[PDB]
Design an enzyme around this catalytic site. Sequence first.
Site, PDB file in Angstrom:
ATOM      1  CG  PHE A 119      -0.216   0.237   2.480  1.00 36.72           C
ATOM      2  CD1 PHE A 119       0.209   1.509   2.831  1.00 36.72           C
ATOM      3  CD2 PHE A 119       0.036  -0.821   3.340  1.00 36.72           C
ATOM      4  CE1 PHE A 119       0.881   1.713   4.008  1.00 36.72           C
ATOM      5  CE2 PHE A 119       0.693  -0.621   4.531  1.00 36.72           C
ATOM      6  CZ  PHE A 119       1.120   0.652   4.860  1.00 36.72           C
ATOM      7  CG  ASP A 127      -5.986  -7.094   5.950  1.00 35.88           C
ATOM      8  OD1 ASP A 127      -5.586  -8.293   5.845  1.00 35.88           O
ATOM      9  OD2 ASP A 127      -5.270  -6.101   5.740  1.00 35.88           O
TER      10      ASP A 127
END
Length: 338
Positions: A27, A143
């Site tokens: 990310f 997650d």
Amino acid sequence: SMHLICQSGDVLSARYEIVDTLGEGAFGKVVECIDHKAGGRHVAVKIVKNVDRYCEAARSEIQVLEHLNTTDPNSTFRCVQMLEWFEHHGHICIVFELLGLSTYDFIKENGFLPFRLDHIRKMAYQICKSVNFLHSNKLTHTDLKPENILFVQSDYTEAYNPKIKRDERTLINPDIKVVDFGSATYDDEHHSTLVSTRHYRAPEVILALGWSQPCDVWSIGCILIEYYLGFTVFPTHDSKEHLAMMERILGPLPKHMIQKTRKRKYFHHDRLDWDEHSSAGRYVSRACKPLKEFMLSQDVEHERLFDLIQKMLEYDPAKRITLREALKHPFFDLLKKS
Ligand SMILES: Nc1ncc2cc3cnccc3cc2n1
């Protein structure tokens, strides 16, 4: 881009001076910064890679955190506080309160040793409380994993420990917060077919049967066992091997889930197509064993934890314990006035 704008000494948004990198990922990265408009307070800034996938998730995370920080301004339910967000050379940056090490990094830096059971009890309670708050707000995290559970402060004491025959750091304060809301999904939003880091992925996800809140509970089960053992319980990148590991630890999968999955790939005649005498068969046969054999003591507190974990790792999501129920589990009694 990112190398060029995340270095130590850089100033973001005429305000935040980067001190160091806290973590990085696909990310982007999280850096520690000095906030020069707020008297020098340190903060964490997540710099998101300029890739549509990750921008979307970041915009999403911002919406979710505005919702949660509004619903829970004091952070009673232990979701990380977002302070602001901005754009910086084409990168979305989100500013957070600064926390300590993730539970993953702590385990890692301690040589992959487990936490003490009383710490696990406290952390487990907070995680369940936090995620149950998400569940109350019609959200699923998707997650959860030790990288996404962070100690509020990772101050510590260090003592020689003849049990390990090595020096060892003990946490002062085991309080935690949950981070990373970029995959968090509302009940009424679209549910992607693939979610969760694979090691913490629920069987309904792997089998593409649909998922919702209960897949978080599975993940928490996985987390709790790793806190107890100090290593990852499903160390694999193959979905079939993962399912084999589940079978070895938890027993065989329910027929009704097998019949129902679109991934008939993994199966032959209502049983997992898996050869135990193969090499990976024997890898799984020795890396994995029945859940209760992982216990390091017969003491009742240990049994209580393992009962809870077992209920979290129920195959059928419709039968799996909810976090509402889990918070009343006997394992937590010691945290309460009786
Ligand atoms: N030390 C520290 N403090 C706050 C954080 C927020 C974060 C928010 N989202 C993802 C990762 C994050 C990591 C963090 N690390």
